[PDB]
Amino acid sequence: DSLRPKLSEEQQRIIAILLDAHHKTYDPTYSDFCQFRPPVRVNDGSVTLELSQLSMLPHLADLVSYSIQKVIGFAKMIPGFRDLTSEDQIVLLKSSAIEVIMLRSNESFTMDDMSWTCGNQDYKYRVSDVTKAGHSLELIEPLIKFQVGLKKLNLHEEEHVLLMAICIVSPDRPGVQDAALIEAIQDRLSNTLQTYIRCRHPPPGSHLLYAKMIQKLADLRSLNEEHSKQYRCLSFQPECSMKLTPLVLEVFG
Ligand SMILES: C=C1/C(=C\C=C2/CCC[C@]3(C)[C@@H]([C@H](C)CCCC(C)(C)O)C[C@H](OC)[C@@H]23)C[C@@H](O)C[C@@H]1O
């Protein structure tokens, strides 16, 4: 029964463009990480101590700061994104920034030891570094289920960039104006994604895969709300702002 329309010229172009954008804004060598404030790991095998030292916060806050910059850059090259008013571009970036960081980071997440391996022991990031940045297990552990859940999809890079683009261009975000444009843009991306999956993804018995990807967008919303909860409390720490960046302040404040 399953019809399998071919990717259209436009759709193939969309994928090309998104692949090129990701390649321009996601360095797979991580050769910039050494420019961040150094990571510090001082023994904590304590919430009080966490908040007292915040040893990993300057380094991780720089990594998130750097990644938001990469994401803004990635957004600009999503076809259609420029046609939105800049006010709406900003709503979408601010609200998706942490979700996209969560998707993109999957390129460094390894199931070998359940860490984000960007090195080089110093830029290997584990659960325990996240807690050393002042967050708790209630965000960290689902973030790790999410990462694993996502590795096991074995996404083609075509789908991976399409999923970040769909994520960013979501019409149902607090404060959007032209929800209809965003939907129109998002729909251009989803249809491309649905078409690709049924042309280029084997077996296939997976009409399943699209649904699983859409569910990942939904897990992301929960994590986002929990990140935000925990950021709000993190910022109650005196002189915490110095350990952040102006951009992390604005995006999450
Ligand atoms: C960010 C990336 C990378 C790893 C991401 C990571 C690993 C370290 C902790 C992070 C950063 C979370 C914490 C909870 C964020 C804390 C932020 C703050 C202190 C402001 O509250 C968000 C996130 O999810 C994977 C985490 C490496 C590479 O794959 C590029 C990608 O761009």
UniProtKB/Swiss-Prot annotation:
Major localization listed first in the record, in broad terms: nucleus
Chain spans, region Interaction with coactivator LXXLL motif: 76-94
Mutation effect (V176M): In VDDR2A; decreased calcitriol receptor activity; decreased affinity for calcitriol; decreased ligand-independent localization to the nucleus; loss of interaction with RXRA; decreased interaction with NCOR1; decreased interaction with NCOA1; decreased sequence-specific DNA-binding
Subcellular location: Nucleus; Cytoplasm
GO BP terms in the entry: apoptotic process involved in mammary gland involution; calcium ion transport; cell differentiation; cell morphogenesis; decidualization; intestinal absorption; intracellular calcium ion homeostasis; intracellular receptor signaling pathway
Modified how: Ubiquitinated by UBR5, leading to its degradation: UBR5 specifically recognizes and binds ligand-bound VDR when it is not associated with coactivators (NCOAs). In presence of NCOAs, the UBR5-degron is not accessible, preventing its ubiquitination and degradation.
Signal peptide feature range: none
Keyword rRNA-binding found: no
Sites where the protein binds calcitriol: Y26, S67, R104, S108, H135, H227
Gene Ontology molecular function terms on file: bile acid nuclear receptor activity; calcitriol binding; DNA binding; DNA-binding transcription factor activity, RNA polymerase II-specific; lithocholic acid binding; nuclear receptor activity; nuclear retinoid X receptor binding; nuclear steroid receptor activity
Residues covered by the NR LBD domain: 10-253
Key words of the record: Cytoplasm, Disease variant, DNA-binding, Metal-binding, Nucleus, Receptor, Transcription, Transcription regulation, Ubl conjugation, Zinc, Zinc-finger
Involvement in disease: Rickets vitamin D-dependent 2A: A disorder of vitamin D metabolism resulting in severe rickets, hypocalcemia and secondary hyperparathyroidism. Most patients have total alopecia in addition to rickets.
Domain notes per entry: Composed of three domains: a modulating N-terminal domain, a DNA-binding domain and a C-terminal ligand-binding domain. The 9aaTAD motif is a transactivation domain present in a large number of yeast and animal transcription factors.
Assembly and oligomerization: Homodimer in the absence of bound vitamin D3. Heterodimer with RXRA after vitamin D3 binding. Interacts with MED1, NCOA1, NCOA2, NCOA3 and NCOA6 coactivators, leading to a strong increase of transcription of target genes. Interacts with the corepressor NCOR1. Interacts with SNW1. Interacts with IRX4, the interaction does not affect its transactivation activity. Interacts with CRY1. Interacts with CRY2 in a ligand-dependent manner.
Described function: Nuclear receptor for calcitriol, the active form of vitamin D3 which mediates the action of this vitamin on cells. Enters the nucleus upon vitamin D3 binding where it forms heterodimers with the retinoid X receptor/RXR. The VDR-RXR heterodimers bind to specific response elements on DNA and activate the transcription of vitamin D3-responsive target genes. Plays a central role in calcium homeostasis. Also functions as a receptor for the secondary bile acid lithocholic acid (LCA) and its metabolites.
Membership in a protein family: Belongs to the nuclear hormone receptor family. NR1 subfamily.
Protein name: Vitamin D3 receptor
Organism annotation: Homo sapiens (Human)
Organism classification: Eukaryota, Metazoa, Chordata, Craniata, Vertebrata
